[PDB]
Design a protein around this ligand. Structure first.
Ligand SMILES: O=C(O)[C@@H](O)[C@@H](O)[C@H](O)[C@H](O)CO
Ligand SMILES: [Cl-]
Ligand SMILES: [Mn+2]
Length: 395
């Protein structure tokens, strides 16, 4: 009702129109200039061109998601100094156009990851899924990483061998593309060969080293962001665990605390993605919002469901997964109200994040799972929760 409701739109080529977005009830668009090569500067011209298309629909461009961080920055090799300079200028250009929140990630090599893009739920709709056994089969029988066996239980290894033996040639190709070619929003894509040689750049890069590389980026970017009035909102790792022998360093509350200890400026903040942090049971989403609320500048309000094997998860309906959506929304609303009580008034934009593929969308070739109807449904569910919390606790 008063909640700042936003919606990820990929641009003119997105099958979801800006009319669909408005009818969904979003007043704000989340988007990026996806066509601009990784690490190059986003010109004012390109920015204003996207901004105008959105304003034309009677919407506003609320959040950027994402400005990509070149791999040379994450490995701290090659042209990193130039890429950082460009990233800085992108932020200058963005703020000059009046776009003041930037979402970004530090997932190395791979972005957000799923093994199955078309998992049929009992109601007949389709969800994204991360099957631990599918993923083990990829790592040990397709990628053949040495020695990936250390990331798995004996039983999972036996199961991975069995699943692989039932896979068709095309099952194996699809699994591979699913994992490495890039899902919607990802700024990197690989063939198996490209992927395998890219992993080698990380043979001497452990958790501590990646943190060091991230620190170089933050200390360079945050002062520019602060100077220019832009707030940075880091998106967590998805899944928030180390995969493929590579570290993942935006997964837990310790990692969030590390980021604040590294750069104190308020320009250094967070995207509270409940779908991603919520994958692992040990993340206390509500505590995360209580502790880091002042720095939460963007939320993704979706939910996942862990299965019998707790590393296997699929995307749930927004109110029926592992995320206690009531408690999460309550904490966000309480954060917005303390801002208001400290004198300001500074809402936290939300987007429904992912949706199931359902109704008309089942007959379409869709961006997984950025189809419209499922995302509309999640948006509406969360709208309702938030409105009732406003009336029950803040009327
Ligand atoms: O939670 C997620 O995985 C999503 O929000 C992503 O689709 C999005 O691209 C994020 O910015 C991570 O790259
Ligand atoms: Cl969205
Ligand atoms: Mn998210």
């Amino acid at each position: 009702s008063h909640m700042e409701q936003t919606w990820r739109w990929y641009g003119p080529n997105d099958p979801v129109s800006l009319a669909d977005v408005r009818q969904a009830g979003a007043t704000g668009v989340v988007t990026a200039l996806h066509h601009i090569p990784n690490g190059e500067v986003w010109s004012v011209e390109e920015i204003l061109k996207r901004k105008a298309i959105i304003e034309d629909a009677g919407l506003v461009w609320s959040v950027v998601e994402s400005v990509p961080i070149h791999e040379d920055i994450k490995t701290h090799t090659g042209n990193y100094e130039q890429w950082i300079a460009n990233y800085q200028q992108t932020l200058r250009n963005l703020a000059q156009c009046g776009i003041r929140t930037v979402c970004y990630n530090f997932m190395p090599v791979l972005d957000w990851t799923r093994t199955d893009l078309e998992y049929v739920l009992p109601d007949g709709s389709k969800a994204l899924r991360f099957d631990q056994i599918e993923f083990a089969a990829f790592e040990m029988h397709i990628l053949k990483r040495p020695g990936a066996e250390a990331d798995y239980t004996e039983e999972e290894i036996a199961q991975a061998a069995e699943r692989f033996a039932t896979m068709s040639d095309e099952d194996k190709a699809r699994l591979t593309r699913n994992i490495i070619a890039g899902l919607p929003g990802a700024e990197e894509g690989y063939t198996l060969d490209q992927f395998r040689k890219h992993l080698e750049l990380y043979k001497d890069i452990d958790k501590a080293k990646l943190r060091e590389n991230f620190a170089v980026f933050l200390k360079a970017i945050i002062p520019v962001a602060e100077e220019v009035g832009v707030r940075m909102a880091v998106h967590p790792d998805d899944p928030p665990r180390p995969i493929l022998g590579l570290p993942r360093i935006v997964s837990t509350i310790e990692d969030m605390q590390w980021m604040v200890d590294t750069v104190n400026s308020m320009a250094n903040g967070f995207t509270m993605c409940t779908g991603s942090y919520g994958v692992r049971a040990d993340n206390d989403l509500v505590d995360m919002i209580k502790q880091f609320g002042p720095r939460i500048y963007f939320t993704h309000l979706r939910s996942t469901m862990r299965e019998d094997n707790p590393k296997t998860f699929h995307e749930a309906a927004h109110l029926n997964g592992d995320v206690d959506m009531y408690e999460v929304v309550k904490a966000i609303v309480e954060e917005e109200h303390r801002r208001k009580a400290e004198g300001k008034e500074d809402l936290i934009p939300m987007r429904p994040d992912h949706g199931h593929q359902m109704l008309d969308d089942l007959k379409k070739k869709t961006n997984p799972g950025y189809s419209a109807i499922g995302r509309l449904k999640g948006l509406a569910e969360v709208r309702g929760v938030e409105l009732a919390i406003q009336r029950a606790f803040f009327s």
